[PDB]
Amino acid sequence: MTLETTLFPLEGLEGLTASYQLYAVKGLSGLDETEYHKNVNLLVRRLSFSMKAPFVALSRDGEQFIAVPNYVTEFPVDHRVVRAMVKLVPTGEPLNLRFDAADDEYDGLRLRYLDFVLQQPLFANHHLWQPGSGQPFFHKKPLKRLDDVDLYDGVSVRAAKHPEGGFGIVCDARSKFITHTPIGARADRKRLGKLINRSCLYKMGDHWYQFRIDAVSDWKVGEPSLFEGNVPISLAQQLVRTAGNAAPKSIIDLDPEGGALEYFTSTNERRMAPAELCFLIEDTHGRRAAKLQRQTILSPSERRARVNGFIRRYLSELNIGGAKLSAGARAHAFFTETHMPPALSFGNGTVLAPDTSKDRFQAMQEYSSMRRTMMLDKKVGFFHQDVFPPQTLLLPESVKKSWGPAFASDFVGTVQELYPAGGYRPEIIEYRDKAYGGGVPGQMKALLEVAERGEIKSGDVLVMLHRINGAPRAQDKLAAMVCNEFEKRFGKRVQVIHSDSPGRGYKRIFKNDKPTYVQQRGRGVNIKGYLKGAALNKVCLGNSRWPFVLRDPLNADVTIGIDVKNNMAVFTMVAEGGRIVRVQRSRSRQREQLLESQVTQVITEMLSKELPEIKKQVQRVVIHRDGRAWPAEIAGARKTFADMAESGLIAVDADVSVFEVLKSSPAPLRLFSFEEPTQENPKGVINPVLGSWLKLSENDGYICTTGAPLLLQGTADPLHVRKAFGPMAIEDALKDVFDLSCLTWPKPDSCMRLPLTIKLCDIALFDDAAE
DNA sequence: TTACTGCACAGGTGACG
Ligand SMILES: [Mg+2]
Secondary structure, rough: OOEEEEEEEOOOOOOEEEEEEEEOOOOOOOOHHHHHHHHHHHHHHHHHHHHHOOOOOOOOOOOOOEEOOOOOOOOOOOOOOOOOOOOEOOOOOOEOOOOOOOOOHHHHHHHHHHHHHHHHHHHHHOOOEEOOOOOOEEOOOOOOOOOEEOOOOOOOEEEEEEOOOOOEEEEEEEEEEOOOOOOOOOHHHHHHEEEEEEEEEEEEEEEEEEEEEOOOOOOOOOEEEOOOOOOOOOOOHHHHHHHOOOHHHHHOOOOOOOEEEEEEEEOOEEEEHHHHHEEEEEEOOOOOOOHHHHHHHOOOOHHHHHHHHHHHHHHHOEEEEOOEEEOOOOOOOOOOOOOOOOOOOOOOOOOOOOOOOHHHHHHHHHHHHHHHHHHHOOOOOOOOOOOOEEEEEEEHHHHHHHHHHHHHHHHHHHHHHHHHHHHOOEEEEEEEEOOOOEEEEEEHHHHHHHHHHHOOOEEEEEEEEEEOOOOOEEEEEHHHHHHHHHHOOOOOOEEEEOHHHHHHOEEEOOOOOOEEEEEEEOOOOOOHHHHHHHHHHHHHHHHOOOOEEEOOOOOOOOEEEEEEEEEEEEEEEEOOOEEEEEEEEEOOOOOOOOHHHHHHHHHHHHHHHHHOOOOOOOEEEEEEOOOOOOOOHHHHHHHHHHHHHEEEEEEEOOEEEEEEEEOOOOOOOEEEEOOEEOOOOOOOOOOOOOOOOOEOOOEEEEEOOOHHHHOOOOOOOOOEEEEOOOOOOOOHHHHHHHHHHHHHHHOOOOOOOHHHHHHHHHHOOOOOOOO
16 A cells, blocks of 8 residues: 655755746637647747747637747747748736646646756756657666667656645656667768668767768768858868867767768758767667567666666756756655456356455455456356357468368367357358469458458458568558458458468378378467467457456446547447447548547447447546547537537436546656565565556546556556546546456456557557558 | 567657758
């Protein structure tokens, strides 16, 4: 029950003052709403980079209002571009904001200034460096050597409300991999060309920073490439001219024949940098480096020690102007009651409840294991038990002709053992995977023409696809294409598997004087485990056969997930306790955003179909956005439900609340708990327990959907949820985010960081790179 | 083993040839 955060108090905040001047944007009378807020935040962004001051937007009433720091001198007031031209008329009354005050609507304004001024002393520390604005600060000295790549340790620092009052700082340790030797002066024109879009650390003497390689310069370092007042000047001359005092040898003694790289400034100017001083950042998610990836996963005591060490070392004294700020060395710590996992309903009227008489950890591990063993027990089994509708297994011809038949028999038998009530009996069909070219077009040509023939009787299809490209930081457009077309042109519900991993599970054997394929079990996959996982996720879940549901009601009657990526939106809906789950994909005119009319269309359609099966009149709705919510999306959701309350489809006083689920948090905070110190663990720091939670604010909370009993290595990463709108209390929203993350359907015996609502969003999108 | 779970990065935007 004893929890420590990575929130540190801020001292000397008194006498620190932040003066702004509200302007209002004449803009265009016509508000495309979605285009209106894009242009506002575009200008706020443009202004911040060009004048280097903490510009902010204050969206109240008219939602305009650009806040200009009072200390900037000449201010254009009128600004070009931005479609129609905009003008800013100051709203008078210049604001001098204090940090000892109660909660205002100007707290977003205070947080922007606080963030901005706090990283000035750090940016001036000769032993630290920052890749770019807003990023963590790293030590210049590498932490670890790692044999041709260097490992750098850094810490993020972000301003945040303090739950006991006032303001503070939330921090987390970060890791970065940079190759040890520079790109080099002797690297030729073609080799530099092969680095476009890669990112490098540039050691410009004592000023280190990161940039993206855009092009290769036509001019070497000692040849004139720019001019310093008419006269042509080499890059070598420019770096000598802007060095100070005791400049390092490396920036005044550059190889004249070396090449230079080119990058774009955040105001879109072009600059050059000598390849002799540039060190490639290892995108480790782009090129599989798993021995590296382990270096990034920290034990709780390592993670707590690195963060606190940075605090006591660089934020003890902090001068911003004539201000003396300190970050206290002791993080905020608290006592709380921890949420227990919810009671669950399985087959045959069987409930699973956490045992309240055992100690918490033993009780959590028993509960979690039992989610798997109850699902498998033919005396209890799946909550939803029924025969499947007809099914199809669509295999490449090359596979059907080799190990396909052996895989299918094993796979069929695995489904029937996992879901005995289903009678799984698929028709096995093939497509000509070698007749048209093996790329994405050509594979799709063969898949569509099997479809066009009508060989896919039955509406459900599981199709085995070939892998085109690896690199886990890419996009598999073939699976998205197949799902898109089969859904749109035929009426099919499609699930996908790939052919590389199951094929590794079979080896050819000579038996009774005939070649046969049998299971193997060396290295490449664990084929028995693969068959069970695919059986649950692709056939059972893909037919909406839910293994277990919540016994008791959530705080919300209905919660809806929303994610938009790649011009494809997903809407998920969970009602009853997961007895009613729905997923609609729909195309979107913007890459990552939704029109107001589209939110209200899809949601009134989705809910209306289901309302006659919701036998409780509905009076609390919650929307879970993956990431930031946009005002037209908030508006489209408030309209949907104000409408339904007037028809009588829903309680006449039902209310909606919108929460942003920030899985990559702008203020990532950690929680730790404690234990008897023990040789290996001299400070006794351990992960928090599964149900731990903390609110900072009426608008910001954290729940551990992952934690102590169920984690193998590393430290739990608490899920940040933020209230965008609505009456519901953040504590109530955190509780049923937690209950929804206990519906661990893809892997029953496990913890799962995302609630089922946006978990369904990640499954269904997989970044839909077509339509 | 990407059938699947965690942790990692992902987030946050002022610099700087
Ligand atoms: Mg993180």
